Design an enzyme around this catalytic site. Structure first.
Site, PDB file in Angstrom:
ATOM      1  N   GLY B   9       0.688  -1.246  -0.075  1.00 10.73           N
ATOM      2  CA  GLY B   9       0.197   0.029  -0.224  1.00 10.73           C
ATOM      3  C   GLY B   9       0.949   1.197  -0.049  1.00 10.73           C
ATOM      4  O   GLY B   9       0.156   2.383   0.418  1.00 10.73           O
ATOM      5  N   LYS B  40      -0.242   2.857  -4.176  1.00  7.23           N
ATOM      6  CA  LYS B  40      -0.702   3.913  -4.510  1.00  7.23           C
ATOM      7  C   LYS B  40      -0.453   4.449  -5.894  1.00  7.23           C
ATOM      8  O   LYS B  40      -1.259   4.889  -6.350  1.00  7.23           O
ATOM      9  CB  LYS B  40      -0.287   4.919  -3.455  1.00  7.23           C
ATOM     10  N   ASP B 116      -7.893   7.316   1.795  1.00  8.96           N
ATOM     11  CA  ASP B 116      -6.930   7.681   2.461  1.00  8.96           C
ATOM     12  C   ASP B 116      -6.163   8.769   1.555  1.00  8.96           C
ATOM     13  O   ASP B 116      -6.166   8.809   0.395  1.00  8.96           O
ATOM     14  CB  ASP B 116      -5.954   6.647   3.055  1.00  8.96           C
ATOM     15  N   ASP B 117      -5.560   9.695   2.263  1.00 11.08           N
ATOM     16  CA  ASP B 117      -4.624  10.823   1.416  1.00 11.08           C
ATOM     17  C   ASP B 117      -5.377  11.544   0.355  1.00 11.08           C
ATOM     18  O   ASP B 117      -5.077  11.654  -0.842  1.00 11.08           O
ATOM     19  CB  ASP B 117      -3.393  10.214   1.223  1.00 11.08           C
ATOM     20  N   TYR B 161      -7.596   8.408   9.527  1.00 12.00           N
ATOM     21  CA  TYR B 161      -7.288   7.107   9.574  1.00 12.00           C
ATOM     22  C   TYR B 161      -6.242   6.539  10.689  1.00 12.00           C
ATOM     23  O   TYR B 161      -5.517   5.495  10.830  1.00 12.00           O
ATOM     24  CB  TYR B 161      -6.578   6.450   8.352  1.00 12.00           C
ATOM     25  N   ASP B 227       8.618   4.291   2.039  1.00 15.87           N
ATOM     26  CA  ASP B 227       8.472   5.361   1.002  1.00 15.87           C
ATOM     27  C   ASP B 227       8.521   7.040   1.429  1.00 15.87           C
ATOM     28  O   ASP B 227       8.504   7.717   0.399  1.00 15.87           O
ATOM     29  CB  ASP B 227       7.097   4.930   0.477  1.00 15.87           C
ATOM     30  N   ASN B 255       2.302  -2.816   6.023  1.00 13.31           N
ATOM     31  CA  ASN B 255       2.510  -1.981   4.835  1.00 13.31           C
ATOM     32  C   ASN B 255       4.333  -1.605   4.954  1.00 13.31           C
ATOM     33  O   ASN B 255       4.699  -0.673   5.781  1.00 13.31           O
ATOM     34  CB  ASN B 255       1.977  -0.614   4.596  1.00 13.31           C
TER      35      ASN B 255
HETATM   36  C1  LIG Z   1      -4.260   3.198   5.815  1.00 12.55           C
HETATM   37  C2  LIG Z   1      -4.024   4.523   5.855  1.00 12.55           C
HETATM   38  N1  LIG Z   1      -3.650   5.110   4.671  1.00 12.55           N
HETATM   39  C3  LIG Z   1      -2.276   5.436   4.356  1.00 12.55           C
HETATM   40  N2  LIG Z   1      -1.742   5.876   3.008  1.00 12.55           N
HETATM   41  C4  LIG Z   1      -0.141   6.383   3.213  1.00 12.55           C
HETATM   42  C5  LIG Z   1       0.440   4.968   2.794  1.00 12.55           C
HETATM   43  O1  LIG Z   1       0.265   4.745   1.602  1.00 12.55           O
HETATM   44  C6  LIG Z   1       1.837   5.236   3.167  1.00 12.55           C
HETATM   45  O2  LIG Z   1       2.851   4.429   2.216  1.00 12.55           O
HETATM   46  C7  LIG Z   1       2.207   5.130   4.544  1.00 12.55           C
HETATM   47  C8  LIG Z   1       3.824   5.344   4.684  1.00 12.55           C
HETATM   48  O3  LIG Z   1       4.243   6.547   3.986  1.00 12.55           O
HETATM   49  O4  LIG Z   1       1.429   6.253   5.326  1.00 12.55           O
HETATM   50  C9  LIG Z   1       0.071   6.460   4.959  1.00 12.55           C
HETATM   51  S1  LIG Z   1      -1.011   5.400   5.614  1.00 12.55           S
END
Ligand SMILES: CCNC1=N[C@@H]2[C@@H](O)[C@H](O)[C@@H](CO)O[C@@H]2S1
Ligand SMILES: CCNC1=N[C@@H]2[C@@H](O)[C@H](O)[C@@H](CO)O[C@@H]2S1
Lengths: 426, 418
Positions: B9, B40, B116-117, B161, B227, B255
């Site tokens: 992820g 992603k 997310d994000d 999250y 990452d 992850n």
């Molecule tokens: C389940 C929460 N969603 C998230 N999206 C990002 C991940 O894709 C990253 O790879 C991780 C580390 O940089 O930090 C957040 S966590």
């Protein structure tokens, strides 16, 4: 003929075959002619140089050598035996021939022996037969050269392969004088310039070295190499070498970024230079590069090349942001004050262009190109974003006393890992 | 049942199909049960989520889901539409179902919608229909859930999250309460702990969030993710999460590093934890790891100590391993006491022999047979090797970074966590 093309000669993950076929295609499209195979960590090229290729390795290697033929790219197979070869043992010498014979039978006509990045001493056995290190290498290089029918192209890479590596200097090196005196005239000598990564390669330096090696040398150029620094990438134009070098040189082989797709500009501008203005060459390379992406604009690529330019120079747009930031930090006590805020707002808008560049690269169709460069682009994006935040914090100090970092932080606010902690103590 | 395995992820170059088949094998050997597909920057997963897979892609994805079945690993297909989806446009919604149906016909029975994000604001059109951002996600998540027959596993990732991402706090978040109250009970909720990269995941924080989302969450763990910083790599053991969490959780999906081969320890120790001492787990994991560092077959090497050293230099986001901290403390002491007597020179010699062990690790790794392993880790190891050699020369003397680095050294928070 004058050799001009690419040496895959860097440390780390080597390119795969599909990438190398794509490179021959590009070399021909840009009217270059030579490929030198020398990836330091393809295990049969250096660490286990004595070992024959397996049946599957041989099939990949012949399929690759055929592609070079098909694309009229001269394929030069190198081998690096100097870590552990015993020069005075004749089965060692036969193991080397046996190894080269096998690649001959794949179709290969051009070869190189590399003696770079090794100790300057010999084993005890070798010191009785040869009077010096230079004697041992040219002895076996000449013997190999002739053993294979004295071929079209044969390259020799000395241990003292750049200005600073010559002891005591270039003109008086007893290693290089032995090389020029006793290496056979049909063998070429590789040279990286005054330094490993030469900012410039003056012609007086090439006259100097040519006189002592009795030959115009072939340039192994490390201007775009990025294997020595995880964080670095070089998308700038070929620069620092006058076109007046071409008649004083036997060739130019560029050792470029380990990330295959990041070398479009590195190879395009070498091509243009082989026929010179660095900025104009860059515009042609960036313009042609643009449509292999489709969204990304030319201005985005201009910014990207300027953030990842050359080993001793940032691009114009990158240097400006750095100066503006240094001026803003230095003059931040005043928060005339109207000039600080005016240039702070303009500085933040330029950071936005780095953010938007990254966003549009991330949506582009060529995922291969994006993956080769992703870590570099996210690196500079996230540091610029913290820099933009720092400038905003400096501007807010006339109405807040809060620290720049408040409270508990995610791991990315503190950068570099253990390596970073060691560097800051330097 | 309780889900434990890996989410791919992370941002950047995702894993290829031959790497993922290898992952299922390792998950099965270690009695893990789940893989969540969520790279992603796999363009059909997020940036161009509306686009169907081509026939060449469909054949690769079908072959991959078959391997997950063959290896008794549950395959969970995630999709991230939230950047530019219009939730109230039924053409958007039909394209989402048309996308999941295509993957369903590849053999996939488990799905996830990830939000997310992304920004917390909606387009004008959607603010007419839905009373809040959480409503719009739960509406379409519920609709997708039922449209495909309410499958055994369906996961939903909220935009808030983790603890720090909750506004204002976890217990009073209007976003999460709408999720807990309105997301259908059979859908699972993903959570990363107090933080994005949680140093610990305490029990009380899971009680707190479970109360407000009305269900035990599935931990998406970023303890080994790397990452977010080019220079970082995490070979340390799974740490900071009590096994008392297992009865309070629906699952744990880690992850991990983008570098496939670097996640032997990360996944081995998660397995060990699922059946706990972080250092015992590391020893077991490194011991077993050693046996895939071969010597090539010759027709005409890495030790356990080498691997301990490598893991201690690239350990965990909030602590270096013992051997790395030791060398770093000794170096600081040598520099500080460099204004100078036999103590200095005695510990300087011992320090450069520790530097020699870094070089010797790198040299033997370089000769190892598993070139895949070397390539995934080369620039990390190349880096620490050449910096230690410069540190070693510097200690003797007493007797870079690119443009990003230049910007970094101008920030005051440079080295502020050293
Ligand atoms: C389940 C929460 N969603 C998230 N999206 C990002 C991940 O894709 C990253 O790879 C991780 C580390 O940089 O930090 C957040 S966590
Ligand atoms: C022709 C001289 N031999 C050389 N071997 C090293 C190369 O393998 C690297 O790629 C380069 C740049 O990091 O530095 C030297 S140059």
């Amino acid at each position: 003929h004058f050799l001009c093309g690419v040496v895959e000669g860097f440390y780390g993950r080597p390119w795969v075959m599909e990438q190398r076929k794509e490179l021959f295609r590009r070399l021909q499209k840009w009217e270059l002619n030579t490929y030198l195979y020398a990836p330091k960590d393809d295990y049969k090229h250096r660490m286990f140089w004595r070992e024959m290729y397996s049946v599957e390795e041989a099939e990949q290697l012949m399929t690759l050598i055929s592609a070079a033929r098909e694309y009229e790219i001269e394929f030069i197979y190198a081998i690096s035996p100097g870590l552990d070869i015993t020069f005075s043992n004749p089965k060692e010498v036969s193991t080397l021939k046996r190894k080269l014979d096998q690649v001959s039978q794949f179709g290969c006509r051009s070869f190189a022996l590399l003696f770079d990045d090794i100790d300057h001493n010999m084993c005890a056995a070798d010191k009785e037969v040869f009077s010096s290190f230079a004697h041992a290498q040219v002895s076996i290089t000449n013997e190999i050269y002739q053993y294979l029918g004295e071929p079209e192209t044969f390259l020799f890479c000395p241990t003292e392969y750049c200005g600073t590596f010559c002891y005591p200097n270039v003109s008086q090196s007893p290693y290089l004088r032995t090389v020029g005196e006793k290496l056979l005239p049909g063998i070429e000598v590789l040279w990286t310039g005054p330094k490993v990564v030469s900012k410039e390669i003056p012609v007086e330096s090439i006259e100097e070295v040519s006189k002592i090696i009795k030959r115009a040398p072939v340039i192994w150029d490390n201007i775009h190499a990025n294997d020595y620094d995880q964080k670095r990438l070089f998308l700038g134009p070929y620069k620092g070498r006058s076109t007046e070098l071409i008649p004083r040189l036997k060739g130019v082989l560029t050792n470029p970024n380990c990330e295959f797709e990041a070398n479009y500009v590195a190879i395009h501008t070498l091509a243009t230079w082989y026929k010179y203005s660095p900025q104009m060459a860059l515009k042609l390379a960036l313009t042609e590069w643009l449509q292999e992406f489709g969204s990304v604009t030319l201005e985005d690529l201009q910014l990207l090349a300027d953030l990842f330019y050359l080993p001793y120079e940032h691009g114009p747009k990158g240097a400006q942001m750095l100066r503006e930031f240094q001026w803003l930090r230095a003059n931040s006590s005043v928060v005339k004050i109207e000039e600080w805020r005016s240039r702070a707002a303009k500085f933040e808008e330029m950071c936005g262009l780095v953010m938007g560049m990254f966003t549009r690269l991330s949506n582009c169709a060529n995922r291969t190109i994006l993956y080769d460069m992703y870590s570099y682009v996210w690196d500079i994006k996230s540091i610029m974003s913290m820099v933009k935040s720092f400038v905003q914090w400096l501007g807010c100090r006339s109405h807040s006393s809060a620290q720049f970092l408040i409270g508990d932080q995610e791991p990315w606010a503190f950068r570099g890992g253990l390596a970073g902690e060691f560097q800051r103590l330097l």
